[PDB]
CSV table of C-alpha atoms in Angstrom, one decimal:
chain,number,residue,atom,x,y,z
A,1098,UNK,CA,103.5,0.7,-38.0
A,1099,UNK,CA,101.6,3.8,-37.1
A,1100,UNK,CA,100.2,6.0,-40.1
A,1101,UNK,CA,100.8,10.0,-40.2
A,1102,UNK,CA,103.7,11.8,-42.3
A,1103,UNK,CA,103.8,9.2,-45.0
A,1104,UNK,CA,100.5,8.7,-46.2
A,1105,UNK,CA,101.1,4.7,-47.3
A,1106,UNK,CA,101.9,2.8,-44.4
A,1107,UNK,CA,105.6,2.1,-44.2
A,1108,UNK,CA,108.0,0.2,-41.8
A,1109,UNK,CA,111.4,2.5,-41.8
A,1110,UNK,CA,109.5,5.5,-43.1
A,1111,UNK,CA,107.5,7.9,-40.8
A,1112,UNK,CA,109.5,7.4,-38.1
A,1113,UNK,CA,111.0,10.0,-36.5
A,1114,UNK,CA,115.1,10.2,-37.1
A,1115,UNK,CA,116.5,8.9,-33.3
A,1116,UNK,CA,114.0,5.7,-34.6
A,1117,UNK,CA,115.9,5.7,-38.5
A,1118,UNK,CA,119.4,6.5,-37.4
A,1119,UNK,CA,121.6,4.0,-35.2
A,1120,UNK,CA,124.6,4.5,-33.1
A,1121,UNK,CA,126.3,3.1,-35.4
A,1122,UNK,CA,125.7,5.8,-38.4
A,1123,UNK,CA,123.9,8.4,-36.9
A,1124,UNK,CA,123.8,9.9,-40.6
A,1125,UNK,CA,120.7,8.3,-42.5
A,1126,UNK,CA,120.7,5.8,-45.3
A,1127,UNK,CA,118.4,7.7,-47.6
A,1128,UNK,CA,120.4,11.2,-47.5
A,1129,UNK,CA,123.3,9.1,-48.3
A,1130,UNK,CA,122.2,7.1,-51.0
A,1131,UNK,CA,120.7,10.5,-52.4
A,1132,UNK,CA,123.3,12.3,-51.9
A,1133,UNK,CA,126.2,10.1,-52.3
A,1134,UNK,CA,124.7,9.4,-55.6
A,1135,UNK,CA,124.1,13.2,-56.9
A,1136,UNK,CA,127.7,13.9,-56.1
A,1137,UNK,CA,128.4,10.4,-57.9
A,1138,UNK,CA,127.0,11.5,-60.9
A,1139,UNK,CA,128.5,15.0,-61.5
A,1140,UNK,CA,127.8,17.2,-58.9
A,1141,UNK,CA,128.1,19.8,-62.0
A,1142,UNK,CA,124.7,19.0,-63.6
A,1143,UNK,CA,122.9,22.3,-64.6
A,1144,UNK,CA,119.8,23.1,-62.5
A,1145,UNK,CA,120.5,20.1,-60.2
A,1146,UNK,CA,118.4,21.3,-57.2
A,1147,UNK,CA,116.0,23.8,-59.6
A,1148,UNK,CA,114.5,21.0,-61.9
A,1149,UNK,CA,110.9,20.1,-60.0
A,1150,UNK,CA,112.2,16.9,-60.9
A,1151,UNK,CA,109.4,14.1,-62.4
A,1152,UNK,CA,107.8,13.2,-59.1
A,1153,UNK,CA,107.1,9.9,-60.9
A,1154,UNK,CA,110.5,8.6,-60.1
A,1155,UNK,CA,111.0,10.0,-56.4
A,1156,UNK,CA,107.9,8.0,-55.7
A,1157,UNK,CA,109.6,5.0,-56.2
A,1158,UNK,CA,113.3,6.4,-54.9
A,1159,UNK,CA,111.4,6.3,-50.9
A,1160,UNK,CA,109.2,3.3,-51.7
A,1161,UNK,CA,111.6,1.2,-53.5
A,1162,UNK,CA,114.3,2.3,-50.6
A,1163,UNK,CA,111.6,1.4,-47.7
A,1164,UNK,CA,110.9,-2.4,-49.4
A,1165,UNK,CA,114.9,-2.9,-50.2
A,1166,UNK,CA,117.3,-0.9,-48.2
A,1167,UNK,CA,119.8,-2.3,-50.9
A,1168,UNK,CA,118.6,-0.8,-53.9
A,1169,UNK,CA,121.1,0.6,-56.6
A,1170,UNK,CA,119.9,4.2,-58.2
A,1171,UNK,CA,122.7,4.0,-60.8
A,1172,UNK,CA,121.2,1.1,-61.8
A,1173,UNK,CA,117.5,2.6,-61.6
A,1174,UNK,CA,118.1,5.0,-64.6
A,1175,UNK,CA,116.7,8.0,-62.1
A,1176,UNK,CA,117.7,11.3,-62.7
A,1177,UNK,CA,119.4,14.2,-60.5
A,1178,UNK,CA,116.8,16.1,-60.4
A,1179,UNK,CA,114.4,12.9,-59.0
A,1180,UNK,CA,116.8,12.2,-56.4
A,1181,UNK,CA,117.4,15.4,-55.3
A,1182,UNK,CA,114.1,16.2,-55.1
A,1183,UNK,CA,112.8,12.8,-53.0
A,1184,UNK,CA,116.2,14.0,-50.2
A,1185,UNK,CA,114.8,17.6,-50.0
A,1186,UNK,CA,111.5,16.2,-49.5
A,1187,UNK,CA,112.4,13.3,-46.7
A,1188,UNK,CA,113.0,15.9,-44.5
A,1189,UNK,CA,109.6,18.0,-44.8
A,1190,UNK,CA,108.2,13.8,-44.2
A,1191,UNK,CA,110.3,14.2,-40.8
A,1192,UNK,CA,108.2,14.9,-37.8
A,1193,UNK,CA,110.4,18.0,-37.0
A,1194,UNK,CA,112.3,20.2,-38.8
A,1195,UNK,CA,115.4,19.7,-39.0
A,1196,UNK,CA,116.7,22.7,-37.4
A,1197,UNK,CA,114.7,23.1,-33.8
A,1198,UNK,CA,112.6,26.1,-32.8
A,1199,UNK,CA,114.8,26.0,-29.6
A,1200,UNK,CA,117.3,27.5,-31.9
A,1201,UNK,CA,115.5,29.4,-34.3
A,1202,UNK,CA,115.8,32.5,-32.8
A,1203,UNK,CA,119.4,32.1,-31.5
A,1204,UNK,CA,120.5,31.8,-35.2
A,1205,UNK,CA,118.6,34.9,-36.5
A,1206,UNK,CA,120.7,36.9,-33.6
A,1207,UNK,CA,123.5,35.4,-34.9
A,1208,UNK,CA,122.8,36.2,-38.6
A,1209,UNK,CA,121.8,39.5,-38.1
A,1210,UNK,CA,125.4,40.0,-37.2
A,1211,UNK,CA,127.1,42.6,-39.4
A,1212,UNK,CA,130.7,41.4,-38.2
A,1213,UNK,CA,130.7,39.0,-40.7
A,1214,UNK,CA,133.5,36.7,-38.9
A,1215,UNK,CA,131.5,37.3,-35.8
A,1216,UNK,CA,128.4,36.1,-37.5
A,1217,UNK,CA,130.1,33.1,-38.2
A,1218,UNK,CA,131.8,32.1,-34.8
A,1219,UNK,CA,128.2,33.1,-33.3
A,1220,UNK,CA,126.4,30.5,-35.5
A,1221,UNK,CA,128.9,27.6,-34.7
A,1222,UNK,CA,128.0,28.6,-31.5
A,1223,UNK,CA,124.5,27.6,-31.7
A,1224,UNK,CA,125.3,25.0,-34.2
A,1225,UNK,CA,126.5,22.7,-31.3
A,1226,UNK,CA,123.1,23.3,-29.9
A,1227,UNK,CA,121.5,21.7,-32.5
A,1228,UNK,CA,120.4,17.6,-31.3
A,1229,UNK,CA,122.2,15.1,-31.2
A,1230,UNK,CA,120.4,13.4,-34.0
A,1231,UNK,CA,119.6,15.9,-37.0
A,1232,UNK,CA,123.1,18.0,-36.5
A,1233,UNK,CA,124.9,14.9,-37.2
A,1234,UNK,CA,122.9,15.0,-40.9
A,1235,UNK,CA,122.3,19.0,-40.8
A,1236,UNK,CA,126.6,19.0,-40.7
A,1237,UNK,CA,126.4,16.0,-43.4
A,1238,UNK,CA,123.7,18.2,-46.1
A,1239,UNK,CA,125.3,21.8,-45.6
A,1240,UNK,CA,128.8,19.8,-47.1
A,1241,UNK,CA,126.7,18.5,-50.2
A,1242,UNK,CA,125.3,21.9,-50.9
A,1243,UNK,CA,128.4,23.7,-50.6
A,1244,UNK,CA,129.9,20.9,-53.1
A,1245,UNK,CA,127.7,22.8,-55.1
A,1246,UNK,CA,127.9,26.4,-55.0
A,1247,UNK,CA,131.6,25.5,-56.3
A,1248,UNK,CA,130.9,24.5,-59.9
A,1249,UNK,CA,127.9,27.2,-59.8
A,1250,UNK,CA,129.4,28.4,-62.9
A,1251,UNK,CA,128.4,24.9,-64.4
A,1252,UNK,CA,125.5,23.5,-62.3
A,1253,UNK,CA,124.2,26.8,-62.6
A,1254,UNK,CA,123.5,26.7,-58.7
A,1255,UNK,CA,125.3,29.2,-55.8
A,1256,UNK,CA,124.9,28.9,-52.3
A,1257,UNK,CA,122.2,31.0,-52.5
A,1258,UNK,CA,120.1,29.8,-54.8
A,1259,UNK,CA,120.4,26.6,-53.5
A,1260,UNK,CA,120.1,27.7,-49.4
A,1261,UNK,CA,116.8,29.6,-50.9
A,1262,UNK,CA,115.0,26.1,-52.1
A,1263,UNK,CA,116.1,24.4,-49.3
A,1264,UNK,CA,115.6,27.2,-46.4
A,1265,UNK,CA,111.7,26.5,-47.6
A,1266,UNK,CA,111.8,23.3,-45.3
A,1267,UNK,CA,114.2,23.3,-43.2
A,1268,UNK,CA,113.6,25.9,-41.4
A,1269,UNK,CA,109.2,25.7,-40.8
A,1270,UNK,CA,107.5,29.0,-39.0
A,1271,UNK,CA,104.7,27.9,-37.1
A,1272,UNK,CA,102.9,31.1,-35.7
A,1273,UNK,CA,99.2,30.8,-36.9
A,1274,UNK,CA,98.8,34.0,-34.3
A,1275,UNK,CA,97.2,37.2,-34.9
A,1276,UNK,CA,100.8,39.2,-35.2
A,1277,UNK,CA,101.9,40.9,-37.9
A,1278,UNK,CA,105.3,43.0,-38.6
A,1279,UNK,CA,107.6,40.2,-37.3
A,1280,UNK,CA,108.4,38.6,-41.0
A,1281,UNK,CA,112.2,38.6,-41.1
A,1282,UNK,CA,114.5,37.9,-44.5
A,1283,UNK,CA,117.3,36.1,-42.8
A,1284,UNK,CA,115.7,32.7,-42.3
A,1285,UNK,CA,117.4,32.3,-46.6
A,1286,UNK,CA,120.6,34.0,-45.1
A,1287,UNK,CA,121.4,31.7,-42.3
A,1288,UNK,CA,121.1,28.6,-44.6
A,1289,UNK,CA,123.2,30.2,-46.9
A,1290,UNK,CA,126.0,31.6,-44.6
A,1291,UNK,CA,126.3,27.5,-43.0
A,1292,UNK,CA,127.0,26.7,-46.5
A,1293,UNK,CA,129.1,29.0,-48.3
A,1294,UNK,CA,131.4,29.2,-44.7
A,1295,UNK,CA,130.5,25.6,-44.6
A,1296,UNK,CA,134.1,24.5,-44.6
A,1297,UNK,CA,135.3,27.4,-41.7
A,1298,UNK,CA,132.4,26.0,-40.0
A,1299,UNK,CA,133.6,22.0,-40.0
A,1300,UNK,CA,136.5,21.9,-42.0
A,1301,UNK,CA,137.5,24.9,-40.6
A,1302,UNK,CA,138.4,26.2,-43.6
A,1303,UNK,CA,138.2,29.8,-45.2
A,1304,UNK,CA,135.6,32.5,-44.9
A,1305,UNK,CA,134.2,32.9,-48.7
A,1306,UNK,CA,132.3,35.4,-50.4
C-alpha cells in the first residue's frame, strides 16, 4: 500500500503489471473488462476512442473496479467513450510504458523500413523482445484496435487515427537533454503498422493497406 501513480491510495492499483497480472492470466482484468465490454457494445460506435469521454465516469470505472473486482459496466450505464478512456489511461498510471526504451530504438529501425513486408518481419522481430509481462497485453490491445480500423467507415476511427491517440502513451520520450534535431515522425507509424498488420503479425494474417 505504497502511494505514487495513483494519487488515492489503492490496494490492486499502482502496482506495477508483474504485481497485477498472475500466471494464470497474464492479460489484466481491467483491459479486459474495458475492452471486452467496448467490443461488447458495438465496436462500431462513432468516435469511440476520439470522445474525451466524461472523466466523471472513468473515475469510478478504476475505483469501483479496485473496491469490487466483480463489477458489471453493462449494468453501470457507462459509456464507450468513459471506458475507453479510463483503459488508455491505466496504462500512462503504469510505472513503465508499456513498450520498453530497450526497444525503442530497435522498432524505429524497423519502421523506417521502406520494404514494407520487411518492415513488418523486422518489427515481429523485436516484438518478441518485448517482456514477458506487458507483450502478453501489448499483443491483446493492438487486436482491439485493429477490431476497429475495420468498421472505420462507421466508428469513424482507422488505424491511424486511433495508433495516433494511443502512440501519445504508449510510447513516452524521456530526454530532458540539451539536444535538438533528433524528433522523429515514426513513433505514430510503428503503432499503427502493429495494428493495421496486426493480424500478419499474430494471426498471421494478410498485409493491409
Amino acid at each position: 500500500g505504497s502511494s505514487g501513480s495513483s494519487g488515492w491510495e489503492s490496494n490492486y492499483f499502482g502496482m506495477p503489471l508483474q504485481d497485477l497480472v498472475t500466471a494464470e492470466k497474464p492479460i489484466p482484468l481491467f483491459v479486459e473488462k474495458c475492452v471486452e465490454f467496448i467490443e461488447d457494445t458495438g465496436l462500431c460506435t462513432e468516435g469511440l476512442y476520439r470522445v474525451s469521454g466524461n472523466k466523471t465516469d472513468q473515475d469510478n470505472i478504476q475505483k469501483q473496479f479496485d473496491q469490487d473486482h466483480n463489477i458489471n459496466l453493462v449494468s453501470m450505464e457507462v459509456t464507450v467513450n468513459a471506458v475507453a478512456g479510463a483503459l488508455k489511461a491505466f496504462f500512462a498510471d503504469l510505472p513503465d510504458p508499456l513498450i520498453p526504451y530497450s526497444l525503442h530504438p530497435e522498432l524505429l529501425e524497423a519502421a523506417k523500413i521502406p520494404d514494407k513486408t520487411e518492415r513488418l518481419h523486422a518489427l515481429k522481430e523485436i516484438v518478441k523482445k518485448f517482456h514477458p509481462v506487458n507483450y502478453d497485453v501489448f499483443r491483446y490491445v493492438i487486436t482491439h484496435l485493429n477490431r476497429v480500423s475495420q468498421q472505420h467507415k462507421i466508428n469513424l476511427m482507422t488505424a491511424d487515427n486511433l495508433s495516433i491517440c494511443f502512440w501519445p502513451t504508449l510510447m513516452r520520450p524521456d530526454f530532458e537533454n540539451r539536444e535538438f534535431l533528433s524528433t522523429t515522425k515514426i513513433h505514430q507509424s510503428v503503432v499503427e503498422t502493429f495494428i493495421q498488420q496486426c493480424q500478419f503479425f499474430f494471426y498471421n494474417g494478410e498485409i493491409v493497406e
